[PDB]
């Protein structure tokens, strides 16, 4: 409400969103570089997602953690909603994975620790992110992971692209809690080591079946300790999924995390 578009110089697009685009921007008085996530009112209204968005703002604005992207504020005009975000200068984990094909165990373990810590803080406030995926994981100036895109975040317990990161309970439209993010963590650990998520398929229908069945195999290069942690996280039964305390203390994480 205090901020308006006239307060910012707009730079290049940083990435595209479902309901608009994110741009690099600079606040005129302070010269503060930040990111402006621009969303079109007509598209949000058509999707009936105005309430979710109010919630993305409300949830993210109260989070304060070095591995969680900051949301400084918002404003809106006749056609758009603007979220004022911390700029993540090293881009997405998505792009790094495309470039490198797969990460080594040390880079994987480090990212998994940073994510587990950010998720521990979230779950302490009963906040479920629910959209943990590489395009929503950004990199700070020191290459540290930052959980971003709280677009689908909710307070636990609750109801609501590809299904690749979604657990069975969310896929079936059943009730879910914080355990959904533990499943996504297992999908991500596999994807970082293998280069593709474990339930990846040509069609949505084939992916749905693979998730429902928890039907996946590891390539031979995946180590025993990596197989153990992934297998523990990818449990059909949410209750069976470990606590984040356990993920951080896991022998493969403690041995490879930097
Ligand atoms: N703060 C940021 N700094 C740098 N790039 C960003 C930032 N926020 C978003 N992006 C880029 O824009 C993309 C879309 O942003 P995101 O918040 O995930 O939107 P959506 O909810 O539409 O998926 C990201 O995947 C990333 O490439
Ligand atoms: C129509 C309208 C308004 C709205 O109240 N607009 S107004 O000021 O009454 C009118 C002169 C423009 C507000 C929002 C909105 C703003 C901030 C957040 Cl975080 C979430 C939602 C949305 C989203 C889609 N449509 C919206
Ligand atoms: O921030 C957004 O673009 C949206 C807000 C409304 C719910 C869906 C959400 C998304 O992240 O896709
Ligand atoms: Mg996103
Ligand atoms: Mg989103």
PDB file of C-alpha atoms and ligand atoms in Angstrom:
ATOM      1  CA  UNK A   1       0.000   0.000   0.000  1.00  0.00           C
ATOM      2  CA  UNK A   2       2.903   2.408   0.723  1.00  0.00           C
ATOM      3  CA  UNK A   3       4.787   1.031  -2.352  1.00  0.00           C
ATOM      4  CA  UNK A   4       3.690   1.764  -5.930  1.00  0.00           C
ATOM      5  CA  UNK A   5       5.147   0.825  -9.404  1.00  0.00           C
ATOM      6  CA  UNK A   6       6.588   4.376  -9.734  1.00  0.00           C
ATOM      7  CA  UNK A   7       8.938   3.572  -6.800  1.00  0.00           C
ATOM      8  CA  UNK A   8      10.867   0.994  -8.912  1.00  0.00           C
ATOM      9  CA  UNK A   9      13.070   0.887 -12.016  1.00  0.00           C
ATOM     10  CA  UNK A  10      12.352  -2.361 -13.848  1.00  0.00           C
ATOM     11  CA  UNK A  11      15.118  -4.549 -15.303  1.00  0.00           C
ATOM     12  CA  UNK A  12      15.156  -7.820 -17.148  1.00  0.00           C
ATOM     13  CA  UNK A  13      12.724 -10.703 -16.650  1.00  0.00           C
ATOM     14  CA  UNK A  14      14.168 -13.210 -14.149  1.00  0.00           C
ATOM     15  CA  UNK A  15      11.744 -15.990 -14.887  1.00  0.00           C
ATOM     16  CA  UNK A  16       8.252 -16.789 -15.921  1.00  0.00           C
ATOM     17  CA  UNK A  17       5.407 -17.608 -13.604  1.00  0.00           C
ATOM     18  CA  UNK A  18       2.040 -19.301 -13.946  1.00  0.00           C
ATOM     19  CA  UNK A  19       0.189 -15.960 -13.431  1.00  0.00           C
ATOM     20  CA  UNK A  20       2.772 -13.453 -14.761  1.00  0.00           C
ATOM     21  CA  UNK A  21       6.547 -12.907 -14.715  1.00  0.00           C
ATOM     22  CA  UNK A  22       9.210 -12.020 -12.171  1.00  0.00           C
ATOM     23  CA  UNK A  23      11.456  -9.085 -12.946  1.00  0.00           C
ATOM     24  CA  UNK A  24      14.664  -7.686 -11.566  1.00  0.00           C
ATOM     25  CA  UNK A  25      13.951  -4.199 -10.132  1.00  0.00           C
ATOM     26  CA  UNK A  26      15.629  -1.431  -8.216  1.00  0.00           C
ATOM     27  CA  UNK A  27      13.924   0.749  -5.594  1.00  0.00           C
ATOM     28  CA  UNK A  28      14.599   4.412  -6.695  1.00  0.00           C
ATOM     29  CA  UNK A  29      15.303   6.107  -3.317  1.00  0.00           C
ATOM     30  CA  UNK A  30      17.544   3.441  -1.713  1.00  0.00           C
ATOM     31  CA  UNK A  31      18.895   1.803  -4.940  1.00  0.00           C
ATOM     32  CA  UNK A  32      17.844  -1.587  -3.325  1.00  0.00           C
ATOM     33  CA  UNK A  33      17.978  -4.398  -5.946  1.00  0.00           C
ATOM     34  CA  UNK A  34      15.076  -6.817  -5.519  1.00  0.00           C
ATOM     35  CA  UNK A  35      12.688  -9.014  -7.518  1.00  0.00           C
ATOM     36  CA  UNK A  36       9.090  -8.050  -8.462  1.00  0.00           C
ATOM     37  CA  UNK A  37       6.767 -11.057  -8.958  1.00  0.00           C
ATOM     38  CA  UNK A  38       3.989  -9.579 -11.191  1.00  0.00           C
ATOM     39  CA  UNK A  39       0.604 -11.377 -11.327  1.00  0.00           C
ATOM     40  CA  UNK A  40      -2.371 -10.440 -13.604  1.00  0.00           C
ATOM     41  CA  UNK A  41      -5.641  -9.805 -11.761  1.00  0.00           C
ATOM     42  CA  UNK A  42      -7.781 -11.172 -14.661  1.00  0.00           C
ATOM     43  CA  UNK A  43      -5.874 -14.521 -14.715  1.00  0.00           C
ATOM     44  CA  UNK A  44      -5.972 -14.887 -10.874  1.00  0.00           C
ATOM     45  CA  UNK A  45      -9.775 -14.063 -10.877  1.00  0.00           C
ATOM     46  CA  UNK A  46     -10.378 -16.546 -13.800  1.00  0.00           C
ATOM     47  CA  UNK A  47      -8.516 -19.259 -11.766  1.00  0.00           C
ATOM     48  CA  UNK A  48     -10.293 -18.181  -8.545  1.00  0.00           C
ATOM     49  CA  UNK A  49      -6.952 -18.133  -6.755  1.00  0.00           C
ATOM     50  CA  UNK A  50      -7.199 -14.576  -5.218  1.00  0.00           C
ATOM     51  CA  UNK A  51      -7.473 -16.026  -1.648  1.00  0.00           C
ATOM     52  CA  UNK A  52      -4.406 -18.276  -2.326  1.00  0.00           C
ATOM     53  CA  UNK A  53      -1.920 -15.416  -3.024  1.00  0.00           C
ATOM     54  CA  UNK A  54      -3.344 -13.419  -0.101  1.00  0.00           C
ATOM     55  CA  UNK A  55      -2.130 -16.593   1.730  1.00  0.00           C
ATOM     56  CA  UNK A  56       1.269 -16.850  -0.203  1.00  0.00           C
ATOM     57  CA  UNK A  57       1.828 -13.196   0.978  1.00  0.00           C
ATOM     58  CA  UNK A  58       0.620 -13.701   4.571  1.00  0.00           C
ATOM     59  CA  UNK A  59       2.662 -16.922   5.049  1.00  0.00           C
ATOM     60  CA  UNK A  60       5.945 -15.892   3.357  1.00  0.00           C
ATOM     61  CA  UNK A  61       6.035 -12.330   4.820  1.00  0.00           C
ATOM     62  CA  UNK A  62       6.275 -13.721   8.391  1.00  0.00           C
ATOM     63  CA  UNK A  63       9.080 -16.243   7.615  1.00  0.00           C
ATOM     64  CA  UNK A  64      12.654 -15.220   8.568  1.00  0.00           C
ATOM     65  CA  UNK A  65      15.302 -17.823   7.825  1.00  0.00           C
ATOM     66  CA  UNK A  66      18.585 -17.592   5.829  1.00  0.00           C
ATOM     67  CA  UNK A  67      17.393 -20.476   3.576  1.00  0.00           C
ATOM     68  CA  UNK A  68      13.914 -19.006   2.921  1.00  0.00           C
ATOM     69  CA  UNK A  69      13.472 -16.276   0.277  1.00  0.00           C
ATOM     70  CA  UNK A  70      12.195 -13.020   1.860  1.00  0.00           C
ATOM     71  CA  UNK A  71       8.923 -11.346   0.828  1.00  0.00           C
ATOM     72  CA  UNK A  72       9.216  -7.643   1.799  1.00  0.00           C
ATOM     73  CA  UNK A  73       5.731  -6.484   0.830  1.00  0.00           C
ATOM     74  CA  UNK A  74       3.190  -6.169  -1.956  1.00  0.00           C
ATOM     75  CA  UNK A  75       1.085  -3.604  -3.791  1.00  0.00           C
ATOM     76  CA  UNK A  76      -1.426  -3.688  -6.635  1.00  0.00           C
ATOM     77  CA  UNK A  77      -2.980  -1.606  -9.359  1.00  0.00           C
ATOM     78  CA  UNK A  78      -5.929  -1.875 -11.768  1.00  0.00           C
ATOM     79  CA  UNK A  79      -4.480  -4.899 -13.623  1.00  0.00           C
ATOM     80  CA  UNK A  80      -1.650  -6.407 -11.529  1.00  0.00           C
ATOM     81  CA  UNK A  81      -0.512  -7.639  -8.090  1.00  0.00           C
ATOM     82  CA  UNK A  82       3.193  -7.123  -7.284  1.00  0.00           C
ATOM     83  CA  UNK A  83       5.097  -9.126  -4.688  1.00  0.00           C
ATOM     84  CA  UNK A  84       8.358  -7.505  -3.523  1.00  0.00           C
ATOM     85  CA  UNK A  85      10.893 -10.345  -3.139  1.00  0.00           C
ATOM     86  CA  UNK A  86      14.540 -10.720  -2.184  1.00  0.00           C
ATOM     87  CA  UNK A  87      16.547 -11.089  -5.457  1.00  0.00           C
ATOM     88  CA  UNK A  88      18.388 -14.527  -5.581  1.00  0.00           C
ATOM     89  CA  UNK A  89      21.419 -13.627  -7.781  1.00  0.00           C
ATOM     90  CA  UNK A  90      22.564 -17.162  -8.719  1.00  0.00           C
ATOM     91  CA  UNK A  91      19.213 -18.275 -10.156  1.00  0.00           C
ATOM     92  CA  UNK A  92      17.410 -21.566  -9.722  1.00  0.00           C
ATOM     93  CA  UNK A  93      18.659 -24.989  -8.650  1.00  0.00           C
ATOM     94  CA  UNK A  94      16.618 -26.082 -11.800  1.00  0.00           C
ATOM     95  CA  UNK A  95      19.072 -24.267 -14.164  1.00  0.00           C
ATOM     96  CA  UNK A  96      22.181 -25.555 -12.276  1.00  0.00           C
ATOM     97  CA  UNK A  97      20.879 -29.162 -12.685  1.00  0.00           C
ATOM     98  CA  UNK A  98      20.264 -28.636 -16.449  1.00  0.00           C
ATOM     99  CA  UNK A  99      23.901 -27.356 -16.807  1.00  0.00           C
ATOM    100  CA  UNK A 100      25.564 -30.047 -14.622  1.00  0.00           C
ATOM    101  CA  UNK A 101      23.096 -32.941 -15.551  1.00  0.00           C
ATOM    102  CA  UNK A 102      23.413 -34.277 -11.920  1.00  0.00           C
ATOM    103  CA  UNK A 103      25.077 -33.158  -8.666  1.00  0.00           C
ATOM    104  CA  UNK A 104      27.751 -34.990  -6.706  1.00  0.00           C
ATOM    105  CA  UNK A 105      26.982 -36.329  -3.220  1.00  0.00           C
ATOM    106  CA  UNK A 106      28.546 -33.338  -1.464  1.00  0.00           C
ATOM    107  CA  UNK A 107      26.516 -30.737  -3.407  1.00  0.00           C
ATOM    108  CA  UNK A 108      23.384 -32.913  -2.956  1.00  0.00           C
ATOM    109  CA  UNK A 109      23.858 -33.375   0.818  1.00  0.00           C
ATOM    110  CA  UNK A 110      24.537 -29.662   1.332  1.00  0.00           C
ATOM    111  CA  UNK A 111      21.329 -28.614  -0.519  1.00  0.00           C
ATOM    112  CA  UNK A 112      19.305 -31.320   1.379  1.00  0.00           C
ATOM    113  CA  UNK A 113      20.648 -29.906   4.746  1.00  0.00           C
ATOM    114  CA  UNK A 114      19.759 -26.276   3.755  1.00  0.00           C
ATOM    115  CA  UNK A 115      16.274 -27.417   2.636  1.00  0.00           C
ATOM    116  CA  UNK A 116      15.739 -29.604   5.778  1.00  0.00           C
ATOM    117  CA  UNK A 117      16.636 -26.597   7.996  1.00  0.00           C
ATOM    118  CA  UNK A 118      14.310 -24.247   6.084  1.00  0.00           C
ATOM    119  CA  UNK A 119      11.534 -26.871   6.213  1.00  0.00           C
ATOM    120  CA  UNK A 120      12.115 -27.457   9.990  1.00  0.00           C
ATOM    121  CA  UNK A 121      11.450 -23.707  10.623  1.00  0.00           C
ATOM    122  CA  UNK A 122       8.353 -23.886   8.337  1.00  0.00           C
ATOM    123  CA  UNK A 123       6.892 -26.945  10.034  1.00  0.00           C
ATOM    124  CA  UNK A 124       7.463 -25.275  13.481  1.00  0.00           C
ATOM    125  CA  UNK A 125       4.835 -22.671  12.338  1.00  0.00           C
ATOM    126  CA  UNK A 126       2.730 -25.560  10.891  1.00  0.00           C
ATOM    127  CA  UNK A 127       3.494 -24.052   7.427  1.00  0.00           C
ATOM    128  CA  UNK A 128       3.495 -26.666   4.577  1.00  0.00           C
ATOM    129  CA  UNK A 129       5.196 -25.351   1.410  1.00  0.00           C
ATOM    130  CA  UNK A 130       3.703 -28.148  -0.884  1.00  0.00           C
ATOM    131  CA  UNK A 131       5.550 -27.047  -4.079  1.00  0.00           C
ATOM    132  CA  UNK A 132       9.152 -27.989  -3.264  1.00  0.00           C
ATOM    133  CA  UNK A 133      10.772 -28.481  -6.719  1.00  0.00           C
ATOM    134  CA  UNK A 134      14.028 -27.274  -8.412  1.00  0.00           C
ATOM    135  CA  UNK A 135      12.473 -24.171 -10.155  1.00  0.00           C
ATOM    136  CA  UNK A 136      11.296 -22.980  -6.680  1.00  0.00           C
ATOM    137  CA  UNK A 137      14.757 -23.347  -5.082  1.00  0.00           C
ATOM    138  CA  UNK A 138      16.868 -20.300  -5.654  1.00  0.00           C
ATOM    139  CA  UNK A 139      20.551 -19.492  -4.986  1.00  0.00           C
ATOM    140  CA  UNK A 140      21.840 -16.630  -2.874  1.00  0.00           C
ATOM    141  CA  UNK A 141      25.123 -14.739  -3.480  1.00  0.00           C
ATOM    142  CA  UNK A 142      27.211 -17.452  -1.671  1.00  0.00           C
ATOM    143  CA  UNK A 143      25.351 -20.220  -3.559  1.00  0.00           C
ATOM    144  CA  UNK A 144      23.212 -21.073  -0.512  1.00  0.00           C
ATOM    145  CA  UNK A 145      19.749 -22.618  -1.187  1.00  0.00           C
ATOM    146  CA  UNK A 146      16.638 -20.463  -0.671  1.00  0.00           C
ATOM    147  CA  UNK A 147      13.126 -21.958  -0.640  1.00  0.00           C
ATOM    148  CA  UNK A 148      10.920 -19.678  -2.729  1.00  0.00           C
ATOM    149  CA  UNK A 149       7.468 -19.724  -4.343  1.00  0.00           C
ATOM    150  CA  UNK A 150       4.986 -20.048  -1.438  1.00  0.00           C
ATOM    151  CA  UNK A 151       2.160 -19.883  -4.010  1.00  0.00           C
ATOM    152  CA  UNK A 152       0.616 -23.176  -2.802  1.00  0.00           C
ATOM    153  CA  UNK A 153       1.656 -22.933   0.886  1.00  0.00           C
ATOM    154  CA  UNK A 154      -0.948 -23.657   3.593  1.00  0.00           C
ATOM    155  CA  UNK A 155      -1.194 -24.195   7.356  1.00  0.00           C
ATOM    156  CA  UNK A 156      -1.252 -27.896   8.364  1.00  0.00           C
ATOM    157  CA  UNK A 157      -3.517 -29.907   8.208  1.00  0.00           C
ATOM    158  CA  UNK A 158      -5.270 -29.103   4.872  1.00  0.00           C
ATOM    159  CA  UNK A 159      -6.846 -29.882   1.385  1.00  0.00           C
ATOM    160  CA  UNK A 160      -6.689 -28.298  -2.184  1.00  0.00           C
ATOM    161  CA  UNK A 161       2.605 -28.604 -13.683  1.00  0.00           C
ATOM    162  CA  UNK A 162       3.618 -32.303 -13.387  1.00  0.00           C
ATOM    163  CA  UNK A 163       2.790 -34.540 -10.418  1.00  0.00           C
ATOM    164  CA  UNK A 164       6.596 -35.358 -10.073  1.00  0.00           C
ATOM    165  CA  UNK A 165       7.015 -33.776  -6.614  1.00  0.00           C
ATOM    166  CA  UNK A 166       3.564 -34.470  -5.174  1.00  0.00           C
ATOM    167  CA  UNK A 167       3.029 -37.257  -2.586  1.00  0.00           C
ATOM    168  CA  UNK A 168       0.227 -39.902  -2.955  1.00  0.00           C
ATOM    169  CA  UNK A 169      -2.109 -38.182  -0.384  1.00  0.00           C
ATOM    170  CA  UNK A 170      -1.999 -34.907  -2.348  1.00  0.00           C
ATOM    171  CA  UNK A 171      -2.374 -36.768  -5.697  1.00  0.00           C
ATOM    172  CA  UNK A 172      -5.583 -38.498  -4.379  1.00  0.00           C
ATOM    173  CA  UNK A 173      -6.995 -35.202  -3.011  1.00  0.00           C
ATOM    174  CA  UNK A 174      -6.873 -36.567   0.572  1.00  0.00           C
ATOM    175  CA  UNK A 175      -6.041 -34.651   3.814  1.00  0.00           C
ATOM    176  CA  UNK A 176      -2.326 -33.875   4.342  1.00  0.00           C
ATOM    177  CA  UNK A 177       0.148 -32.348   6.815  1.00  0.00           C
ATOM    178  CA  UNK A 178       3.902 -31.430   6.936  1.00  0.00           C
ATOM    179  CA  UNK A 179       4.836 -34.963   5.750  1.00  0.00           C
ATOM    180  CA  UNK A 180       4.126 -33.874   2.177  1.00  0.00           C
ATOM    181  CA  UNK A 181       7.346 -31.803   2.269  1.00  0.00           C
ATOM    182  CA  UNK A 182       9.328 -34.818   3.545  1.00  0.00           C
ATOM    183  CA  UNK A 183       8.198 -36.765   0.403  1.00  0.00           C
ATOM    184  CA  UNK A 184       9.245 -33.832  -1.864  1.00  0.00           C
ATOM    185  CA  UNK A 185      12.650 -33.843  -0.126  1.00  0.00           C
ATOM    186  CA  UNK A 186      13.092 -37.518  -1.112  1.00  0.00           C
ATOM    187  CA  UNK A 187      12.081 -36.772  -4.728  1.00  0.00           C
ATOM    188  CA  UNK A 188      14.644 -33.870  -4.813  1.00  0.00           C
ATOM    189  CA  UNK A 189      17.468 -35.928  -3.294  1.00  0.00           C
ATOM    190  CA  UNK A 190      16.924 -38.543  -6.019  1.00  0.00           C
ATOM    191  CA  UNK A 191      16.649 -35.896  -8.756  1.00  0.00           C
ATOM    192  CA  UNK A 192      19.872 -34.130  -7.612  1.00  0.00           C
ATOM    193  CA  UNK A 193      21.806 -37.428  -7.747  1.00  0.00           C
ATOM    194  CA  UNK A 194      20.199 -38.990 -10.830  1.00  0.00           C
ATOM    195  CA  UNK A 195      19.257 -35.949 -12.922  1.00  0.00           C
ATOM    196  CA  UNK A 196      15.563 -36.869 -13.128  1.00  0.00           C
ATOM    197  CA  UNK A 197      12.805 -37.279 -10.529  1.00  0.00           C
ATOM    198  CA  UNK A 198      12.051 -40.952  -9.554  1.00  0.00           C
ATOM    199  CA  UNK A 199       8.442 -41.047 -10.915  1.00  0.00           C
ATOM    200  CA  UNK A 200       9.104 -39.150 -14.169  1.00  0.00           C
ATOM    201  CA  UNK A 201       7.045 -40.347 -17.176  1.00  0.00           C
ATOM    202  CA  UNK A 202       5.646 -39.309 -20.583  1.00  0.00           C
ATOM    203  CA  UNK A 203       2.153 -38.842 -19.266  1.00  0.00           C
ATOM    204  CA  UNK A 204       0.500 -37.638 -16.100  1.00  0.00           C
ATOM    205  CA  UNK A 205      -1.398 -40.948 -15.904  1.00  0.00           C
ATOM    206  CA  UNK A 206       1.808 -43.062 -15.874  1.00  0.00           C
ATOM    207  CA  UNK A 207       3.396 -40.692 -13.187  1.00  0.00           C
ATOM    208  CA  UNK A 208       0.239 -40.890 -11.031  1.00  0.00           C
ATOM    209  CA  UNK A 209       0.439 -44.763 -11.077  1.00  0.00           C
ATOM    210  CA  UNK A 210       4.195 -44.720 -10.256  1.00  0.00           C
ATOM    211  CA  UNK A 211       3.591 -42.415  -7.224  1.00  0.00           C
ATOM    212  CA  UNK A 212       0.522 -44.313  -5.960  1.00  0.00           C
ATOM    213  CA  UNK A 213       2.583 -47.579  -6.114  1.00  0.00           C
ATOM    214  CA  UNK A 214       5.873 -45.870  -4.934  1.00  0.00           C
ATOM    215  CA  UNK A 215       7.324 -47.565  -8.026  1.00  0.00           C
ATOM    216  CA  UNK A 216      10.920 -46.403  -8.671  1.00  0.00           C
ATOM    217  CA  UNK A 217      14.428 -47.876  -9.166  1.00  0.00           C
ATOM    218  CA  UNK A 218      17.892 -46.404  -8.593  1.00  0.00           C
ATOM    219  CA  UNK A 219      20.747 -46.406 -11.183  1.00  0.00           C
ATOM    220  CA  UNK A 220      23.806 -48.419  -9.984  1.00  0.00           C
ATOM    221  CA  UNK A 221      25.950 -45.321  -9.186  1.00  0.00           C
ATOM    222  CA  UNK A 222      23.598 -44.271  -6.344  1.00  0.00           C
ATOM    223  CA  UNK A 223      25.398 -45.173  -3.107  1.00  0.00           C
ATOM    224  CA  UNK A 224      23.929 -47.276  -0.267  1.00  0.00           C
ATOM    225  CA  UNK A 225      23.586 -44.302   2.156  1.00  0.00           C
ATOM    226  CA  UNK A 226      21.830 -42.203  -0.554  1.00  0.00           C
ATOM    227  CA  UNK A 227      19.473 -45.175  -1.297  1.00  0.00           C
ATOM    228  CA  UNK A 228      18.683 -45.506   2.424  1.00  0.00           C
ATOM    229  CA  UNK A 229      17.685 -41.810   2.968  1.00  0.00           C
ATOM    230  CA  UNK A 230      15.638 -41.650  -0.347  1.00  0.00           C
ATOM    231  CA  UNK A 231      13.865 -44.997   0.438  1.00  0.00           C
ATOM    232  CA  UNK A 232      13.042 -43.728   3.941  1.00  0.00           C
ATOM    233  CA  UNK A 233      11.512 -40.462   2.615  1.00  0.00           C
ATOM    234  CA  UNK A 234       9.486 -42.002  -0.183  1.00  0.00           C
ATOM    235  CA  UNK A 235       6.998 -43.861   2.051  1.00  0.00           C
ATOM    236  CA  UNK A 236       3.372 -44.086   0.764  1.00  0.00           C
ATOM    237  CA  UNK A 237       2.330 -43.777   4.392  1.00  0.00           C
ATOM    238  CA  UNK A 238       3.012 -40.174   5.586  1.00  0.00           C
ATOM    239  CA  UNK A 239       3.496 -41.321   9.267  1.00  0.00           C
ATOM    240  CA  UNK A 240       6.404 -43.604   8.155  1.00  0.00           C
ATOM    241  CA  UNK A 241       8.331 -40.632   6.658  1.00  0.00           C
ATOM    242  CA  UNK A 242      11.126 -39.523   9.066  1.00  0.00           C
ATOM    243  CA  UNK A 243      11.248 -36.312  11.099  1.00  0.00           C
ATOM    244  CA  UNK A 244      13.527 -33.559   9.671  1.00  0.00           C
ATOM    245  CA  UNK A 245      15.756 -33.930  12.781  1.00  0.00           C
ATOM    246  CA  UNK A 246      16.467 -37.511  11.531  1.00  0.00           C
ATOM    247  CA  UNK A 247      17.215 -36.294   7.930  1.00  0.00           C
ATOM    248  CA  UNK A 248      19.833 -33.840   9.279  1.00  0.00           C
ATOM    249  CA  UNK A 249      21.391 -36.512  11.538  1.00  0.00           C
ATOM    250  CA  UNK A 250      21.301 -39.227   8.794  1.00  0.00           C
ATOM    251  CA  UNK A 251      24.808 -40.810   8.324  1.00  0.00           C
ATOM    252  CA  UNK A 252      24.957 -40.065   4.558  1.00  0.00           C
ATOM    253  CA  UNK A 253      23.943 -36.387   5.174  1.00  0.00           C
ATOM    254  CA  UNK A 254      26.458 -35.867   8.058  1.00  0.00           C
ATOM    255  CA  UNK A 255      29.240 -37.524   5.951  1.00  0.00           C
ATOM    256  CA  UNK A 256      28.745 -35.462   2.736  1.00  0.00           C
ATOM    257  CA  UNK A 257      27.151 -32.169   3.898  1.00  0.00           C
ATOM    258  CA  UNK A 258      29.475 -29.114   3.794  1.00  0.00           C
TER     259      UNK A 258
HETATM  260  N1  LIG B   1      13.651 -13.626  -6.135  1.00  0.00           N
HETATM  261  C1  LIG B   1      13.954 -14.156  -7.323  1.00  0.00           C
HETATM  262  N2  LIG B   1      15.210 -13.992  -7.812  1.00  0.00           N
HETATM  263  C2  LIG B   1      15.518 -14.546  -8.992  1.00  0.00           C
HETATM  264  N3  LIG B   1      14.737 -15.261  -9.812  1.00  0.00           N
HETATM  265  C3  LIG B   1      13.503 -15.402  -9.307  1.00  0.00           C
HETATM  266  C4  LIG B   1      13.042 -14.909  -8.093  1.00  0.00           C
HETATM  267  N4  LIG B   1      11.725 -15.281  -7.876  1.00  0.00           N
HETATM  268  C5  LIG B   1      11.409 -15.947  -8.962  1.00  0.00           C
HETATM  269  N5  LIG B   1      12.431 -16.060  -9.869  1.00  0.00           N
HETATM  270  C6  LIG B   1      12.389 -16.754 -11.161  1.00  0.00           C
HETATM  271  O1  LIG B   1      11.061 -16.702 -11.675  1.00  0.00           O
HETATM  272  C7  LIG B   1      10.491 -18.028 -11.714  1.00  0.00           C
HETATM  273  C8  LIG B   1       9.032 -17.981 -11.323  1.00  0.00           C
HETATM  274  O2  LIG B   1       8.901 -17.521  -9.949  1.00  0.00           O
HETATM  275  P1  LIG B   1       7.931 -18.150  -8.879  1.00  0.00           P
HETATM  276  O3  LIG B   1       7.797 -17.389  -7.600  1.00  0.00           O
HETATM  277  O4  LIG B   1       8.294 -19.600  -8.664  1.00  0.00           O
HETATM  278  O5  LIG B   1       6.545 -18.083  -9.666  1.00  0.00           O
HETATM  279  P2  LIG B   1       5.357 -19.129  -9.847  1.00  0.00           P
HETATM  280  O6  LIG B   1       4.535 -19.259  -8.602  1.00  0.00           O
HETATM  281  O7  LIG B   1       4.582 -18.580 -10.967  1.00  0.00           O
HETATM  282  O8  LIG B   1       5.950 -20.504 -10.218  1.00  0.00           O
HETATM  283  C9  LIG B   1      11.391 -18.852 -10.801  1.00  0.00           C
HETATM  284  O9  LIG B   1      11.288 -20.247 -11.034  1.00  0.00           O
HETATM  285  C10 LIG B   1      12.762 -18.235 -11.071  1.00  0.00           C
HETATM  286  O10 LIG B   1      13.268 -18.686 -12.327  1.00  0.00           O
HETATM  287  C1  LIG B   2      -9.620  -7.016  -7.908  1.00  0.00           C
HETATM  288  C2  LIG B   2      -8.480  -7.496  -7.041  1.00  0.00           C
HETATM  289  C3  LIG B   2      -8.069  -6.843  -5.873  1.00  0.00           C
HETATM  290  C4  LIG B   2      -8.716  -5.564  -5.431  1.00  0.00           C
HETATM  291  O1  LIG B   2      -9.219  -5.442  -4.316  1.00  0.00           O
HETATM  292  N1  LIG B   2      -8.604  -4.483  -6.287  1.00  0.00           N
HETATM  293  S1  LIG B   2      -9.117  -3.015  -5.904  1.00  0.00           S
HETATM  294  O2  LIG B   2      -8.043  -2.325  -5.249  1.00  0.00           O
HETATM  295  O3  LIG B   2     -10.369  -3.172  -5.220  1.00  0.00           O
HETATM  296  C5  LIG B   2      -9.326  -2.435  -7.452  1.00  0.00           C
HETATM  297  C6  LIG B   2      -8.934  -1.047  -7.847  1.00  0.00           C
HETATM  298  C7  LIG B   2      -8.124  -2.196  -8.307  1.00  0.00           C
HETATM  299  C8  LIG B   2      -7.044  -7.344  -5.066  1.00  0.00           C
HETATM  300  C9  LIG B   2      -6.377  -8.525  -5.398  1.00  0.00           C
HETATM  301  C10 LIG B   2      -5.255  -8.941  -4.507  1.00  0.00           C
HETATM  302  C11 LIG B   2      -4.322  -8.012  -4.037  1.00  0.00           C
HETATM  303  C12 LIG B   2      -3.277  -8.396  -3.217  1.00  0.00           C
HETATM  304  C13 LIG B   2      -3.142  -9.727  -2.883  1.00  0.00           C
HETATM  305 CL1  LIG B   2      -1.756 -10.241  -1.962  1.00  0.00          CL
HETATM  306  C14 LIG B   2      -4.054 -10.669  -3.310  1.00  0.00           C
HETATM  307  C15 LIG B   2      -5.106 -10.271  -4.114  1.00  0.00           C
HETATM  308  C16 LIG B   2      -6.770  -9.217  -6.564  1.00  0.00           C
HETATM  309  C17 LIG B   2      -6.329 -10.416  -7.214  1.00  0.00           C
HETATM  310  C18 LIG B   2      -7.083 -10.551  -8.335  1.00  0.00           C
HETATM  311  N2  LIG B   2      -7.976  -9.511  -8.436  1.00  0.00           N
HETATM  312  C19 LIG B   2      -7.799  -8.678  -7.357  1.00  0.00           C
HETATM  313  O1  LIG B   3       1.918 -16.884  -6.877  1.00  0.00           O
HETATM  314  C1  LIG B   3       1.225 -17.360  -7.759  1.00  0.00           C
HETATM  315  O2  LIG B   3       1.439 -17.170  -9.028  1.00  0.00           O
HETATM  316  C2  LIG B   3      -0.066 -18.117  -7.531  1.00  0.00           C
HETATM  317  C3  LIG B   3      -0.974 -17.483  -6.475  1.00  0.00           C
HETATM  318  C4  LIG B   3      -2.328 -18.198  -6.425  1.00  0.00           C
HETATM  319  C5  LIG B   3      -2.187 -19.717  -6.235  1.00  0.00           C
HETATM  320  C6  LIG B   3      -1.215 -20.336  -7.239  1.00  0.00           C
HETATM  321  C7  LIG B   3       0.127 -19.607  -7.207  1.00  0.00           C
HETATM  322  C8  LIG B   3       1.258 -20.263  -7.953  1.00  0.00           C
HETATM  323  O3  LIG B   3       2.367 -20.129  -7.283  1.00  0.00           O
HETATM  324  O4  LIG B   3       1.150 -20.881  -9.005  1.00  0.00           O
HETATM  325 MG1  LIG B   4       7.506 -21.464  -9.174  1.00  0.00          MG
HETATM  326 MG1  LIG B   5       4.156 -20.807  -7.506  1.00  0.00          MG
END
